[PDB]
């Protein structure tokens, strides 16, 4: 719905993405081709996922983009990216102006394909980008920071005012780059457990982890790991959360 | 509120008690309360009662 319309902003995003011939790029929500056109001009082929049948039909008749485009008229939420990576024969460079509504579930959907994604460049609500990148001991640090950082290097790109879109959104936007780790810095036996620990910790972020994770870790276990039970969810590092996930897997 | 009459008939007498409580102090409750909304609108509707 909120179509990117500012030319300078557009140029800045294209410059950041830096599409190169030979890369397999996939846009989620090409819309009115604000990014599709300039990105596609640098490529021989380009894949898009577009739910609006009206706008998809306009891409197909673009004289230069058309011949280059593979258009999937489906929902990205349940799109099999892992299978698309197999077809393109290489990890995917994903990009797009994402609707605020689906942005967080889509990111987790993409994260689950690990290896299959080279990188992601998404427009999101600015506060979402701040959480994604946040480190411990700050307000923005939460479960999303930890899960996102387990999977990826999180790289803020641009902040974008409402006036850059037509119609304008109600809140500031930002572009973030997400790069799945080539080498996972803190591997976890089973991610569902990491997901569970962070949910429990952050659902009670104004309590010490002694209290919020007391159903899962004794004070002795926490002390043994070098984790201070007087600390709260937001004081615990990504590394420590992963150490807790592995413990709970190697011991329960 | 207590009705009772001899000589079977459905006259009424009922709307007589309908002037002290009834659907009024009822709908008064119904939804939420008031707090500041009343002490104000109760002291503004009073202005109305002047002319």
């Amino acid at each position: 719905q909120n179509f990117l319309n500012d030319q300078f902003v557009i140029d800045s995003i294209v410059s950041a993405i830096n599409p190169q011939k030979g890369q397999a790029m996939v846009e989620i929500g090409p819309g009115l081709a604000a990014l599709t056109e300039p990105v596609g001009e640098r490529l021989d082929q380009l894949t898009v996922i577009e739910l609006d049948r009206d706008l998809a039909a306009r891409l197909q008749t673009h004289p230069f983009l058309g011949p280059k485009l593979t258009i999937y008229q489906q929902d990205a939420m349940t799109f099999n990216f892992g299978e698309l990576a197999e077809k393109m024969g290489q990890p995917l460079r994903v990009f797009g102006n994402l609707p605020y509504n689906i942005s967080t579930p889509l990111m987790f959907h993409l994260f689950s394909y690990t290896d299959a994604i080279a990188d992601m460049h998404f427009m999101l609500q600015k506060e979402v980008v701040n959480r994604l990148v946040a480190g411990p001991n700050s307000k923005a640090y939460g479960r999303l920071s930890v899960m996102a950082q387990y999977y990826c290097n999180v790289i803020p790109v641009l902040e974008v005012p409402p006036s850059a879109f037509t119609p304008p959104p109600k809140v500031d936007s930002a572009v973030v780059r997400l790069v799945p780790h080539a080498t996972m810095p803190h591997p976890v036996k089973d991610v569902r457990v990491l997901s569970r620990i962070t949910t429990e910790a952050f659902n009670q972020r104004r309590k010490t982890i002694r209290n919020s994770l007391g159903n899962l870790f004794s004070v002795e276990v926490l002390t043994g790991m070098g984790i201070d039970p007087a600390m709260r969810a937001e004081n615990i590092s990504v590394a420590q959360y992963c150490q807790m996930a592995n413990y709970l897997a190697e011991n329960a | 509120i207590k009705v009772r009459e001899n000589e079977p008939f459905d006259v009424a007498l009922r709307r007589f008690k309908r002037s002290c409580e009834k659907a009024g102090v009822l709908a008064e409750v119904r939804r939420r309360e008031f707090y500041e909304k009343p002490t104000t609108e109760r002291k503004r509707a009073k202005a109305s009662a002047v002319k």
Partner: protein
């Protein structure tokens, strides 16, 4: 087959629906009616002339005894505080005393905030 002879009749007059039960003297269920069960449902009920056909349905389930007289207990506001008593006066029943048993507290519990569109 008990022949209660006379028994009060509660009229649970509400907004989204209304229901009247012709209980006995002590307060035992002898026959209850219901707008929701009176053909039309959804919300078409409520209306007075819609509840009357409901409570009147009792004279078909509680008629197995022989109620020669009965009082009326109207509780809560809504389109069914008058209609009910009327239909009952025509059904053939008698009357002994009309009264409103609507729960009118003294600022006890704090009602729901709700509605705000």
């Amino acid at each position: 087959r008990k022949q209660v002879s006379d028994g009060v009749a509660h009229i649970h007059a509400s907004f989204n629906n209304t229901i009247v039960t012709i209980t006995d003297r002590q307060g035992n269920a002898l026959g209850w009616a219901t707008a929701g069960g009176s053909g039309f449902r959804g919300s078409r009920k409520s209306t007075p002339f819609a509840a009357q056909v409901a409570a009147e349905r009792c004279a078909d389930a509680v008629k197995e005894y022989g109620i020669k007289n009965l009082e009326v207990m109207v509780k809560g506001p809504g389109p069914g505080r008058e209609s009910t008593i009327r239909a009952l006066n025509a059904a053939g029943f008698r009357i002994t005393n009309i009264t409103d048993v609507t729960p009118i507290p003294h600022n006890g519990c704090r009602p729901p905030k709700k509605r705000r569109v």
